[PDB]
Ligand binder design. Structure first.
Ligand SMILES: CCc1sc(-c2ccc(OC)c(OCCF)c2)nc1CSc1nc(N)cc(N)n1
Ligand SMILES: CCc1sc(-c2ccc(OC)c(OCCF)c2)nc1CSc1nc(N)cc(N)n1
Ligand SMILES: CCc1sc(-c2ccc(OC)c(OCCF)c2)nc1CSc1nc(N)cc(N)n1
Ligand SMILES: O=c1ccn([C@@H]2O[C@H](COP(=O)(O)OP(=O)(O)O)[C@@H](O)[C@H]2O)c(=O)[nH]1
Ligand SMILES: O=c1ccn([C@@H]2O[C@H](COP(=O)(O)OP(=O)(O)O)[C@@H](O)[C@H]2O)c(=O)[nH]1
Lengths: 233, 233
């Protein structure tokens, strides 16, 4: 609706939720869509019940559950991003919606990561990739992205923050896994070598911020780059 | 409006393939959309390569592959029927499109039954429905049916017929599997006990055709009821 759509990308525990929540406080032209998987990461809604189970099922047995979890993660995202469109930033002069991650990290980071680590077989990956393509087109381009903000960070800054977040299930995450996630983020967003099936993406503008230096009290220079990035779009 | 949509529903080997192969030829204004599954079961397309695979895996282990099959089956059925509704009968005197089965068959006969057969656990079946509900609901006027034609064959007949069809992986089909699909079509289409989350499935006219008797060289009376049926549409 004239709305500027910006995805916040980055590895686990770089500080996306930290950042996004900051951004939404600085303006009423600025809203957020939080990552469904994070809300799952716990009357209650029929989606969290579903998300709660599949999420723990994934911890126990990634090889049994990744296709199922990926398709539900993405679905939950598609419908949440479409529902912020149709009722957030009602109504503004400069409206920005910050997606916490995007249907593109769903597939080109995580799903891909699970496939390359053999948690999904070829049939499941190609089905997902076929499922992802189509789900996107029918219920699609009104979420086409105006820009991407990459909350970059060495993978060793992230486990620090995992350890820092006081979450027990995550203490177990290996450096090599984060380093797996991290590298996939650099090729997509630092080297721009990952070619996706999406034409307009190759020419989506990217803003790279270093979140190594803790920002949570000291975020103004990071915010200035967003604002300066936002005027260029 | 203004291609009429009519689903042909029936037990496995009840005579659907054969009734729509016969129907297609009778009117230039009539076209058929067979289902993905029917066509998998025998360089292929992506879907063709994936569909053969997930059928074969589902045969070998349903309680691992049902969610996956059932998601990809219903997705491709929607995509096959979208094509036709978008490209065929473009403008012709009185267009009626015949669907081999529908997305309610996918859900309320096949998915439903595998959950009851413990091939889909609660979370899979919850997720399966969410996605079916929310999605079929996005294009809301579009794949909606103007009629249903039910072919009532008996499991023995359908059995006596999976026989005459002599496919191999189909001799592996037991008679007691056929008995609950029957019980489900009767309950949904004839008895009308079945509650569905698409309210208009209560209004929609249903033509039931006792198709026990053979009908390759004697279909006139059936087509005769078919034309009659549509003339009330
Ligand atoms: C946050 C929930 C989990 S659990 C998990 C996982 C858990 C255990 C595993 O092995 C024991 C595992 O193996 C992955 C190796 F490739 C992955 N990966 C994830 C992330 S996959 C993902 N996909 C999305 N689409 C979004 C999102 N936020 N995360
Ligand atoms: C980023 C989320 C991840 S990823 C992950 C993981 C991924 C890959 C792993 O090996 C390849 C891995 O090894 C430890 C699992 F035994 C953990 N664990 C987690 C934490 S699972 C979890 N479950 C929750 N219910 C909540 C919560 N905060 N985190
Ligand atoms: C060729 C399709 C198959 S294969 C199959 C099957 C095969 C072997 C099985 O056990 C050995 C089986 O389950 C038996 C115990 F649950 C189901 N069920 C089916 C019916 S699933 C289905 N879903 C649809 N949505 C459409 C459609 N035509 N068929
Ligand atoms: O500048 C920062 C960035 C992150 N964190 C902490 O590191 C953890 C990870 O942040 P977040 O949940 O936002 O990471 P995400 O998973 O959203 O990237 C949290 O406990 C934050 O409070 C912090 O204290 N200061
Ligand atoms: O009156 C009939 C109807 C069907 N068939 C045969 O039954 C087999 C399977 O039936 P069909 O594919 O029509 O059933 P569907 O699964 O398509 O409902 C085919 O080899 C048909 O030739 C038959 O011999 N006589």
């Amino acid at each position: 609706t004239r709305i500027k759509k910006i995805s916040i990308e980055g590895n686990i525990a770089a500080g996306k939720s930290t950042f996004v929540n900051i951004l939404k406080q600085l303006s009423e032209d600025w809203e957020v869509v939080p990552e469904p998987v994070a809300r799952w990461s716990n009357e209650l809604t029929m989606e969290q019940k579903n998300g709660g189970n599949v999420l723990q099922m994934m911890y126990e047995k990634p090889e049994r559950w990744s296709f199922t979890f990926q398709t539900y993660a993405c679905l939950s995202r598609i419908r949440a991003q479409l529902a912020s469109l149709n009722g957030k930033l009602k109504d503004a002069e400069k409206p920005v919606l910050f997606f916490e991650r995007s249907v593109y990290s769903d597939r080109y980071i995580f799903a891909s990561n699970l496939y390359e680590s053999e948690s999904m077989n070829e049939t499941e990956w190609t089905i997902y990739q076929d499922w992802h393509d189509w789900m996107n087109n029918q219920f699609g381009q009104s979420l086409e992205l105006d820009g991407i903000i990459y909350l970059q960070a060495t993978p060793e800054t992230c486990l620090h923050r995992i350890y820092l977040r006081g979450r027990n299930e995550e203490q177990g995450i290996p450096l090599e896994y984060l380093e797996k996630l991290h590298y996939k983020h650099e090729s997509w967003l630092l080297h721009r070598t990952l070619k996706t099936n999406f034409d307009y993406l190759q020419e989506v503008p990217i803003l790279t911020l270093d979140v190594n230096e803790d920002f949570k009290d000291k975020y103004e220079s990071l915010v200035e780059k967003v604002k300066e990035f936002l005027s260029t779009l």
